[PDB]
Amino acid sequence: EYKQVDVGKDGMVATAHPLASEIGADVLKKGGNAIDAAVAIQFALNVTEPMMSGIGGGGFMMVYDGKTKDTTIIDSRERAPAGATPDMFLDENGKAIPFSERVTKGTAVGVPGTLKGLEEALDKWGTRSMKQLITPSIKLAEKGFPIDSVLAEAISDYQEKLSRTAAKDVFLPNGEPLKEGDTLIQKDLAKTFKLIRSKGTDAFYKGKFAKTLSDTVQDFGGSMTEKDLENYDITIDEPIWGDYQGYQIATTPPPSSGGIFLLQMLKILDHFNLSQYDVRSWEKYQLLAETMHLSYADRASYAGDPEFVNVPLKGLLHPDYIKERQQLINLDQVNKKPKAGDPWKYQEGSANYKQVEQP
Amino acid sequence: TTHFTVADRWGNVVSYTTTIEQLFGTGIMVPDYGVILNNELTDFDAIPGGANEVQPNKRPLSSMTPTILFKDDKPVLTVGSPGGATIISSVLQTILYHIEYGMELKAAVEEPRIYTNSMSSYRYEDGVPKDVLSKLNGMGHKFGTSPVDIGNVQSISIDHENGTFKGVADSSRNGAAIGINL
Numbered sequence: 001e002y003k004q005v006d007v008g009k010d011g012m013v014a015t016a017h018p019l020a021s022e023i024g025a026d027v028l029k030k031g032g033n034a035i036d037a038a039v040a041i042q043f044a045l046n047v048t049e050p051m052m053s054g055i056g057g058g059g060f061m062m063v064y065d066g067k068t069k070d071t072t073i074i075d076s077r078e079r080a081p082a083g084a085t086p087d088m089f090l091d092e093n094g095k096a097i098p099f100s101e102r103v104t105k106g107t108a109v110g111v112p113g114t115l116k117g118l119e120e121a122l123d124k125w126g127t128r129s130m131k132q133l134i135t136p137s138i139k140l141a142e143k144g145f146p147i148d149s150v151l152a153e154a155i156s157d158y159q160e161k162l163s164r165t166a167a168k169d170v171f172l173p174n175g176e177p178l179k180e181g182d183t184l185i186q187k188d189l190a191k192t193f194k195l196i197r198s199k200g201t202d203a204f205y206k207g208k209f210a211k212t213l214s215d216t217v218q219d220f221g222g223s224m225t226e227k228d229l230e231n232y233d234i235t236i237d238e239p240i241w242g243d244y245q246g247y248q249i250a251t252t253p254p255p256s257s258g259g260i261f262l263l264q265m266l267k268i269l270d271h272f273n274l275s276q277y278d279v280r281s282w283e284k285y286q287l288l289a290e291t292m293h294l295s296y297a298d299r300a301s302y303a304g305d306p307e308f309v310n311v312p313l314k315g316l317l318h319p320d321y322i323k324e325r326q327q328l329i330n331l332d333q334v335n336k337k338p339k340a341g342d343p344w345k346y347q348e349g350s351a352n353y354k355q356v357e358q359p
Numbered sequence: 360t361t362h363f364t365v366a367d368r369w370g371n372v373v374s375y376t377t378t379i380e381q382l383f384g385t386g387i388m389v390p391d392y393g394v395i396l397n398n399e400l401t402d403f404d405a406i407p408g409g410a411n412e413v414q415p416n417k418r419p420l421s422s423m424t425p426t427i428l429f430k431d432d433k434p435v436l437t438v439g440s441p442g443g444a445t446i447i448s449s450v451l452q453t454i455l456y457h458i459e460y461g462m463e464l465k466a467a468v469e470e471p472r473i474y475t476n477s478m479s480s481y482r483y484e485d486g487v488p489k490d491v492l493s494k495l496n497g498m499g500h501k502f503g504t505s506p507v508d509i510g511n512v513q514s515i516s517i518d519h520e521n522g523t524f525k526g527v528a529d530s531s532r533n534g535a536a537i538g539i540n541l
């Protein structure tokens with residue numbers, strides 16, 4: 001039966017769902033490579049962990065190429081449509097639309113990039129066709145699979161928003177949320193996958209599917225058009241690298257805030273050498289907490305899409321800046337007013353945006 | 360959001376975080392096509408003017424951190440996780456535990472994490488000693504009355520010495536690691 005830790009001589013797959021891990025492992029066992037397996041996995045997760053990811057969203061796929069030895073990122077982050085505007089999430093009085101409500105609006109839908117990113121990946125490193133790789137997920141969607149406790153919970157927990165769209169025909173069968181044990185069948189999704197299998201991503205970014213999605217986003221209030229989908233292209237990002245304990249870390253650059261701040265928190269913590277303290281000591285937690293407070297403050301002030309704003313990446317990781325931040329941390333007291341620092345002092349240029357508190 | 364990773368016989372390595380934002384995203388499905396649509400644009404700032412303000416054709420700031428660690432130019436570890444702004448903290452913690460504390464990969468992944476982005480936002484997992492939480496709150500921290508799971512780290516280690524692979528899925532979800540033999 002399925003394991004949460006395994007070893008292998010010829011490869012390895014680790015995913016949040018057994019059926020997706022089985023599909024990706026099947027691809028490797030039959031001779032395909034990690035990228036082929038990853039694409040297979042993404043379609044499988046789209047079907048079996050539907051509330052978590054899919055061709056309706058986007059992601060960051062980092063790939064180390066064993067042939068060329070280079071590491072790159074297929075950035076499939078969604079883009080706001082051309083009709084989106086800076087205050088689209090504010091009400092008529094200038095106040096933000098309550099979050100839980102904001103989440104269900106058409107204006108919240110980004111132009112999906114996942115399918116485009118899988119296409120790009122296969123194009124660069126694939127050894128199996130999208131046709132071969134998507135087929136096992138067409139079967140899970142078409143013929144179904146039994147849902148566990150978790151998916152059953154998500155369904156009940158989100159019944160209200162699901163009950164408001166066509167999504168209720170799949171997850172809220174008659175008027176009831178599918179329960180653990182029930183078979184989840186996704187016939188329309190299987191149809192879409194079969195269209196992608198024969199037509200390619202054009203099946204998604206152009207044609208009829210494009211028009212229905214665009215039309216639906218409009219029906220729920222957003223401004224997405226067919227041209228927005230026609231305009232979409234993923235981005236190929238270079239990893240941000242950092243030296244750490246003798247290792248080199250390749251992580252995600254903006255539009256993600258992840259890579260910069262993972263590196264910044266590690267550099268900040270270096271001054272305090274955590275392992276001199278027991279892993280569950282209050283000291284270790286105290287230091288992680290104070291470090292997170294500084295880095296998340298910097299994230300909130302300086303992180304954004306780099307095609308649009310100047311993110312002071314060199315400054316946020318500059319050793320003297322890191323030293324300034326480490327200076328603010330004390331084992332024996334809490335900084336009750338943690339604030340972003342000034343990384344611009346350690347690099348050229350200035351922000352082309354302001355500091356605006358968010359609700 | 361979900362994170363998975365794959366490594367093959369040829370040296371290729373994949374660390375991939377992917378999402379539709381909230382669970383079920385907007386909740387909107389393309390009628391007749393079964394595709395649930397993301398609500399990714401709410402990751403933009405609701406009040407404009409800052410680095411992460413909404414702009415036409417701009418991408419909303421993400422926290423996804425698929426990462427690969429190298430030792431002597433060979434990939435030796437992959438890490439990633441779902442969790443919104445907490446992703447950064449889960450990935451940071453797994454690296455800290457596996458690298459600085461030297462813990463075996465699974466144990467590093469399962470080590471109770473904490474998360475706090477401001478003086479009013481704190482989270483901790485079951486296992487953070489209650490006496491420690493009381494000492495930290497005693498100093499001004501605001502950890503709550505109950506634990507919550509944080510993140511879901513899938514990770515692969517690669518031992519180039521023995522030419523072997525090790526996969527781990529976080530017990531926070533029902534994930535699975537499967538090694539390949541032949």
Ligand SMILES: N[C@@H](CCC(=O)O)C(=O)O
Pocket residue numbers: 360361378379380381399402420421422423440441442443444446
């Ligand atoms: N939308 C978030 C992820 C949401 C989650 O992981 O729960 C991001 O891109 O960072």
